[PDB]
Paper text:
HspB1, an abundant molecular chaperone, is prevalent in striated muscle where it is phosphorylated in response to cues including mechanical stress. Each HspB1 monomer is composed of a conserved core α-crystallin domain (ACD) flanked by a short flexible C-terminal region, which makes intra-oligomer contacts, and a longer N-terminal domain (NTD). The NTD also confers oligomeric stabilization, with phosphorylation at Ser15 and Ser78 or Ser82 causing a shift from a large polydisperse ensemble to smaller oligomeric species, including dimers. HspB1 is phosphorylated in cells and tissues in response to stretch, inducing translocation to the Z-discs and to regions of increased traction force within the cytoskeleton, suggesting that phosphorylation may trigger or modulate its interactions with mechanosensitive clients such as FLNC at these sites.
We found that a segment of the NTD just downstream of the ACD in HspB1 adopts a range of conformations and determined how they are modulated by phosphorylation to trigger oligomer dissociation. Upon refinement of the ACD, the 2Fo-Fc and difference density maps displayed a clear unmodeled feature occupying a pocket between the β3-β4 and β8-β9 loops, which lies on the side of the subunit close to the dimer interface. We were able to build peptides into this density but only accommodating subsets of the 11 possible residues, with their side-chain densities remaining poor in contrast to the ACD. An ensemble of the four peptide-bound ACDs provides the best overview of the interaction available from these data. The binding site aligns with the dynamical changes we observed by NMR. Our results reveal how the β2 strand and PPR assume heterogeneous conformations. Although predominately disordered in solution, this region is also capable of making intramonomer associations with the β3 strand and stretching to the pocket between β3-β4 and β8-β9 loops, as well as intersubunit interactions by occupying a β4-β8 groove in a neighboring dimer. While it is not clear what the relative populations of these states are in the context of the full-length HspB1, they are consistent with multiple NTD conformations contributing to maintaining sHsp assembly. Our combined data reveal that this heterogeneity is modulated by phosphorylation, resulting in changes in the stabilities of the interfaces that are likely responsible for shifting the equilibrium away from large oligomers toward smaller species. The conformational plasticity may be the primary source of the modulation in chaperone activity associated with HspB1 phosphorylation, exposing binding sites both directly through intramolecular rearrangements and indirectly by causing oligomeric dissociation.
Author numbering:
A (entry chain K): 76 to 80
B (entry chain J): 77 to 78, 84 to 85
C (entry chain I), D (entry chain L): 76 to 79
E (entry chain B), G (entry chain C), H (entry chain A), I (entry chain H), J (entry chain F), K (entry chain E), ...: 84 to 170
F (entry chain D): 85 to 170
Write the structure that this text describes.
Amino acid sequence: ALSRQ
Amino acid sequence: LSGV
Amino acid sequence: ALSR
Amino acid sequence: ALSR
Amino acid sequence: GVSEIRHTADRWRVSLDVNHFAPDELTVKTKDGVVEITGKHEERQDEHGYISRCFTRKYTLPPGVDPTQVSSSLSPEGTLTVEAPMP
Amino acid sequence: VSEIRHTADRWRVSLDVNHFAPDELTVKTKDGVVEITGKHEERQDEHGYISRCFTRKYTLPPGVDPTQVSSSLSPEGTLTVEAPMP
Amino acid sequence: GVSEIRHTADRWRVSLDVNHFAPDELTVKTKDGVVEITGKHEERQDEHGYISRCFTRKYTLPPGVDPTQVSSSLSPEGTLTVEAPMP
Amino acid sequence: GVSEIRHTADRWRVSLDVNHFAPDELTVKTKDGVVEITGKHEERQDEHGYISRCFTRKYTLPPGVDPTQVSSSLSPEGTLTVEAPMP
Amino acid sequence: GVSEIRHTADRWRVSLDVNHFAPDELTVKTKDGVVEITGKHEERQDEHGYISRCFTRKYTLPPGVDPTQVSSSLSPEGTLTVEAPMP
Amino acid sequence: GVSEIRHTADRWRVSLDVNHFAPDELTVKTKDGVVEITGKHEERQDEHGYISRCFTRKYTLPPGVDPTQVSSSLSPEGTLTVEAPMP
Amino acid sequence: GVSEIRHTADRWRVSLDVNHFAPDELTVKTKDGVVEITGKHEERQDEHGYISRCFTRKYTLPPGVDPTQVSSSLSPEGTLTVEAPMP
Amino acid sequence: GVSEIRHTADRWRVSLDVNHFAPDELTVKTKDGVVEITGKHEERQDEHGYISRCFTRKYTLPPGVDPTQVSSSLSPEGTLTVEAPMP
């Protein structure tokens, strides 16, 4: 789902 | 005759 | 399911 | 304003 | 099921074919000398695909029938029988 | 199902009473307690003839004017009881 | 002589959810061909406040059912079943 | 130049009995690769009393079918045929 | 957006999703048996940023429709319904 | 969550930690001197289980800044930076 | 007679940080063996501007747990603990 | 001597669905630090009638990007992607 790095 |  |  |  | 009329001298009785509906998907209510039968089931798969159904059916009773004595039951073959004693 | 809706300026509760008409419900406040009672006579629902009765009580925050308690029933059967915070 | 097979009468059945009532707070009674089910519990504290409940529900038996053959059983899930053999 | 004979694309087809519904009581719609057939008629008198009906049935189109090329036609007997050309 | 048409024996009706346009930004005119719908709005932020839009849509009416009987109205949800009675 | 201030004499700038939200789940509008940032993602599994989230944060702009010159961009680490020139 | 010591049943528990939410802004509900925690607070002011937040997180209970025995408590540091006894 | 690894600049990106427009009916230009995406197609027939469409969407570029380095590409599905290298 992304946006967490 | 009529939640939450 | 239902009848039948 | 517009409809939505 | 079978959708026929089966009146007698001592009993008003009708049968209705509702093989697509389960017991909990049917309701029978009597008001103002009229029997009202309602059926409704959600979208579900049958032999052809996804389908939802709904219907309302009404019968007119003879005068003097006590609505608290109307009986209704569903057979395993899908025949709904509604009956009541004649005055 | 007594959905609580409190804030910092209003005490509010909503109750599901879809089987009851407006003239079958009563709300009264006494000694820091709101009492809600419903009662309806024998009546046909989706399964047949049935009569129902209940009493429910809620504790008000201390210092609520009982004359500022309002109750209203929506067309879908939600009873909302609310009052302002002092 | 030879052993025989015999048919057995159908059974009438209704189910009712009464999860709010304990077994000793429910009664099942038959009068004039009508099954009366009554629940009642005294004031009780729940998640929101205090609550007392009471209800009486009725079902009309099919004609000819022996009222002395009516039975009922309550499951752990709080569902009450009422059963009777057909004539 | 000379005239030419060309092959034609196969056709997808389903049939449905809807004799209880008039043309103006049926709608055929396609969305997301699914054909949706809806029927609904208001209360009317029949040989047993009064009756209203409603239904919604769905079919999944094969992959590659142009949804704008789906068509239908009702027969006098009450059978609705829906079809569309294959890729 | 999506456009839904339904032509019955008594009425012609089309519903159009124009949920970016205000009532004073839409126009419906009929001439030569064709309904012409035009929308235009100036630069305006939506969920992605500033944008302006314009469109013109035309529908051919069935024979005999009186253009003075065409009605058009926009719902709060942004659906424009244009309809006319059949002769 | 935490918002960092990076104003200068020439540009109004803030950075917001929104690591749970993807680019298509964020919206930045500017109206009447207020920047409004909204986020919403549907139920999905994280390290602890299923969760959904929604938020709306507003910043007040200094007077006289062109709302059409506000730019917003999300970094791959999840930092939303909103920027605009000073008047 | 003498006093007696009794064993006590194990307890299932989960812990969650919700420091941004007040007691009247958190709800704990059980549905079909699933605990659902919902938080929601209206727009308030903070160090950087205005903010409003909402979330819903779910946990699947171990089989056999009595859903009527789920309880929770909020600590001063804003930590919510949910637990229930094992059969 | 040994080979050398070098870092490469980040890229700013936006994506847009324009499946209603053909390639030559779309244009992408930069002016005053803003990207203008314009679509426009003349009247043409579809499954309902005739339709013409136009739109202009804008995006404020991040500070310091070279406007001559803006590029776009249109996938077969109908999504336009615009990107540019960051400082």
